[model samples]
Target: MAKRIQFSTVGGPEVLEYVDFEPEAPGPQAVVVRNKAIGLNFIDTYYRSGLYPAPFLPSGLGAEGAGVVEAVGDEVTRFKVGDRVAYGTGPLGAYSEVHVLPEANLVKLADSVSFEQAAALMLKGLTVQYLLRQTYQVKPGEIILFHAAAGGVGSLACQWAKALGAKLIGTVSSPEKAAHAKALGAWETIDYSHEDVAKRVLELTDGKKCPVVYDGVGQDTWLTSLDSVAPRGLVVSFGNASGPVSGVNLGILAQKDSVYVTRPTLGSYANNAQNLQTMADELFDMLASGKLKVDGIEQYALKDAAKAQIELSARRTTGSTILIP
Candidate 1:
C-alpha cells in the first residue's frame, strides 16, 4: 500500500502523479523508515519545474521528512530499528509512505517534538539556524532586513533574530502578512507591494542601514537587498521563490560601500553529520523553550501535496507546510 509523488515531466503541480512504489530494505550505511510526516518547501518546485531538475526522469519528490526506523543496515551505527528520526537534507523522495535514508542524514528526535513539527521546521529552521547564527553572525543590538519575512524561514528568522537582541525589518506583500511577521518578533514589516523597499529600510535604520540583509524573495528584491546593508555589512541571498537571481554586476558591491554578499545553500552549511546534528539540536531546544513557535505552519495530506505547491508558488502561504501520510 506504499505510495509517493513521482514525475518524469517537469512543469507544475499538474505534472505530479501519485503512484504505487515498492519499499526496500536498507543497504550499508542506510535505514528503511516508515514515514510519519513530510515537509513541503519552495525548493520542491525548483526540482519539479525543471529549474533545478531531478537527477533523472521519473524521480520521487521532496527533501524533508520525519519517521521511525523500521530496519537498519548492518553497517549503520547512527540508528536502530524502532528509533524515531527526522531528516531535511537528502537524496529526494521524501513525499512517500516510507523512506530509505543514509544514517548520516537522520537525527534522533526528542519526545517533546511531534513528527509533523520536525517535518515542518527541519529544512526551514535549519536554514535560519545557520544564516542568523553562523552566516553573518547577528550580534545583539544590530539591525537586520529579511525578505519574504512572513514565509517559512523568514518567519523563523523574525523570531530567532529578535530573541538574539536584534531589531528586524521584514518585507511582505500585505498588511495581514505584516501582522503575521510582527507576531513572530519582527520589529517592522514593509508591504513591498506598495512601499519602496530600500527607502523603508533606510527610514527604519535612520540611514545607518542594516548589518545584514537576508534576500530570499530574489529577482524582485536583489537591488533592495544591496541598498539595505551598510558598509562591511553582509547580504545572504539564499532562496529564489520569485525567480532565479541573475545578471548581477559585482560592481554593485563595490559601489555599495564594500558590503559583502554570499549565496549559500543549506547542504553546504550543514555539510557534515556533526554540523547537521548541532543545528537540529539547537532548533529542537528553541522549540521546546517556546521561543520558536510553529504557529503559522500548515498541513495537508500527502496526496494533496501538489495543491500545496501551487499555493506556495503563488505566494499564498505564509509559513511552513507539511504533508501527512
Candidate 2:
C-alpha cells in the first residue's frame, strides 16, 4: 500500500503520522506522480506549527516533488504515463509515495536535472528566480542584502545573485554559516550573531545602504531589513522563519526614507503555467550551465518527515533537504 505523512491536528512535527493510503484516480486535468524525491522546506513547518493554517484537518503535507508520471487524466495533453515530471507548487500531497495534482502544476524534468536535484531546486529555485529577478530585478554591481544567507533559498540566492553580477551581502548567524555563504558566491557576509547587521551594511556600502534587502528570515530580521535599505529602496519580506511580521506601522516606511515593502510568495509570481514554465526555463538553464548548482541535498525517508521537520525547524539542516519516497 502507498503511504504518506498526514496530520490530524496543527501543532508540531510530532503531530504528523505515516500511514497507508489508497490514491484515487486522477481527476480530469490532473496527473498522478509516483514521487522519487520530495522537497522538505521551512514553509512546511509553518503549516505544521499552525503559523500558516491548513485548509482542513487530516491533511497531507508538502508541495514539491519530482518523479515519473504514473497516470494522467483524460484532459491531460501535456504529459503522459512514464513522462519524467516534477511539480513545485501543490495541492498539498507531495509527502506521499504518490501525489496527484493538476497538470498545470507539473513541469517536464529536463534531461540534465536529476530527481533529487529537481525536487530540491523546484520550489527553492523558483523562489530565488522571482525574488531576485521579478520582485526587484537585481542588477550588475548593485549592493543587496539577503538574510539567512546559508539557507535553502539563500544558498540559491547567493549563487543566482553572483551570476547576475550583483554584490550580495548575506547575513548569517555564525562564522560557519558566513563561510558557507561566501563560498556560494556571496560578495560578503555579516555575522549577525555578534556584529550588528545594520551597522555592518552601513560600513560596507559606505552609507549608501542597499537598494534592496531580501528578508525571508521574517520578524527577527524585519527591523534590520528596513534599516539596511537605502532611500526609496525596496524590502522584500518573503517568509516567516523567525515569525510573521504583524501589526505594522505604515509610518515606519515614510520615516525610513520612503522605502517600499513587498511581501511576495511564489504563487503570485508563477501563478500560471506560462509564468511557471518561464521561470523554470530560466532556472533549468542556470542549473544546466552549472551556475545554480543544487548542493547538500539532505535526505530523509518519507516516513521520517517528522524528523526532517524537526531538523529544519531547529535550523540544523543546511541547503535543500529532500525526502525519498
Candidate 3:
C-alpha cells in the first residue's frame, strides 16, 4: 500500500487527507513511479480553495513531481522500470508515494539532475520556457518586468531573461526578496510596498518603459502592469498569485498606450505531444549547459502537506517546496 494525498470538497488545506491504498500496475503505455519528491505550487492552493474549480470531486492533489520508475506497462518502450523520471500533470494525484503515469506525460531526468531539482523545476521551468521563448520571444537588449521576483517562476524568469540577454526589472514585496531577485539576475528590483512600480520601471528603462510585463499578481498589480508597459507593449497575465483579476473592459487597452494583453495557460503551450517534448528538450538542454538553475527546495513529509500549503499561501517560503513521500 502506498500513501497518497486525497481531498474532498474545495476549501482550505484541511480538505487534504493522506491515506493508504494499493496502486494498480501500469497498463499499456503507462509507467509507475515511486515518489521521491513532489512539487508544491500556488495553483494547487487555488484548486483546493475553489478559486480554481476542481476537475473532479474527491480528487488527488498536486501536479508536479519526480521519482524512479517502479513498473512499466508492456507498451512503454521509452522507459524501464528503474529509470528516473518526472512529470507535470493535471487531475492532481502527485502528492502520493507512487503514481501511474502515461508514457506521453513522463520526461526522463538527466543523470546530472537530482530528484529534488527535477521535481522543483519541471512545472516552473517549462512555464518559463513558454513565457520567455514562445509567448513574448524576449530578445537581446529588450526590457521586461516580472512580478514576485523571489518566487519559483519569477526566479526562473529572471535567469531566463538574462540568458536571452534581456534587462529584467522585477518587483518584490520586501528588501530580502529584492536581494534574492538581484542575485537571480534582475538588473533592477522595485519594492512594491514602498515604490511606485510603474514609475520606477520607467525610470529604470530610461523612459522607454518595458516592452512586456509578465504579471502573475492579479488585480493588485493589473493596472500598474498596464502603466508599466511602453506604447503598444504587451502585458502577459500568466498567473494570479494574489487574486483573480475581474471586471475588465476591453476599452482599457486602447486607453493604456494601445497595449496588448493575454491571459495564457500552460495547457495552451503544451497541448500536444510534440510541443511538450520540444519544450522539455529545450529545458533539459539549458540545464545541461548550466544556463538554468533550480536553486531552492524546502521539503515536507507526505502527511504535512497542509502545513506546507499554509506556509506557501502566507508567502513565508521562497523558491520551490516539495513533499517527500
Candidate 4:
C-alpha cells in the first residue's frame, strides 16, 4: 500500500488526509511513476478552499511532481523503467508516492537537475516561459513589473526576463523578500507595504510606464497593475495569490491608456505534446545555461504536507517548496 493525500470534501488544509492507497496497473498510454518530490502551488489552495470548484469529489490534489518510471503500459514507448521525469499535468494526483499519468504529459528530467529542482521548476518555469516567449515576447530593454517578486514564480520570472535583457521591477512585502528579488536579477524592487507601487513605477520609468505588468496577486494588485502600464500596454493577470478579481468592464481597459488584458494558465499553454515539450526543453536549456535558477526549497516528508500547506498559505515560506516522498 502507498500513502497519498486525498480529500473527501473541498475546504481547508484540514480536509487533506494521508491514507493508504492501492494503485492500479498502468492503462494503455500510461506509466506508473514512483514520485520523488511534489511541487506545492497557490492553485492547490484555490482547489481546497472551493474557490475553484471541482466537478467531482474525493480527488487527489497537486499539479506537478518529479519521479522515476516504475512501470509502463504496453503502448507507452517514450519512457522505460528507471527513467527520471517531471510533469505539470492537470487532473491532480501528484501528492501520492506513486502516480499513473498519461505518457503525453511527462517530460524527461536531465541528469544535471535534481528531483526537487525539477518539481519546483516544471509548472512555474513553463508558465513564465509561455508568458515571456509566447504571450508578449519580452525584448531587450523592455521594462516590466512582476508582482510577488520573491515568490516561486516571480523569482523564476525575474531571472528569465533578465536573461532576455529585459528590465524587471518586482514587488514584495518585506525587506528580506525585496533583497531576494534583487538577487534574482530584479533591476528594482518595490516594497508594496512601504511604497506606492503605481507611483514608484511611474517615477522610475519617467512616467513612460511599463509596457507589460505581470500580476499574480489578484485583487490586491489589480488597480495598481492597470495604472502601472504604459499607453496600450498589456496586463497579464496570471494568478490569484491575494484574492480573485471580479466585475470587470471592458470599457475600463480603454480608460486605462487603452491597456490590453489577458488571463492565462499553464494548461492552456501546454495543451499538447509539441507545446509541452517545447516549453519544458526551453526551461531545461535555460537552467543548463545558468540563466534561470530555482532557489529556497523547504522540503517536507510526504506525511508532512499539511504543515507545508499551512506555512505556504500563511506566507511563511519563500521561493519554491517541495514535498519529498
> Which number leads on lDDT?
2
Model 4, which residues run further than 4 Å from truth?
A: none
lDDT of each: 0.89, 0.92, 0.87, 0.90
lDDT of 4 by residue, 118-141 (tens): 989999899989989988899999
Give candidate 2's whole-model lDDT: 0.92
Q: Tens digits of per-residue lDDT for model 2 on 43-139?
A: 8888878877888888888999999999999988999899998888968889999999999888999787899999999999999999999999999
Candidate 3 per-residue lDDT, tens place, 64-157, comes to: 8999999999988899978999887644678899988687778888888888988888889889999999999999989899999988888888
Candidate 2: lDDT of 319?
86
TM-score (C-alpha, index-matched) for candidate 2: 0.99
- In the predicted model 4, the residue pairs found to clash are none
Candidate topping TM-score: 2
Candidate 2, superposed: residue stretches over 4 Å from native: none
Error at 237, model 3, angstroms: 0.7
Question: Order of all candidates by lDDT, from best down to worst?
Answer: 2, 4, 1, 3
lDDT of 3 at 53: 76
- Winner on lDDT between 1 and 4 is 4
TM agreement with the true structure for every prediction: 0.98, 0.99, 0.96, 0.98
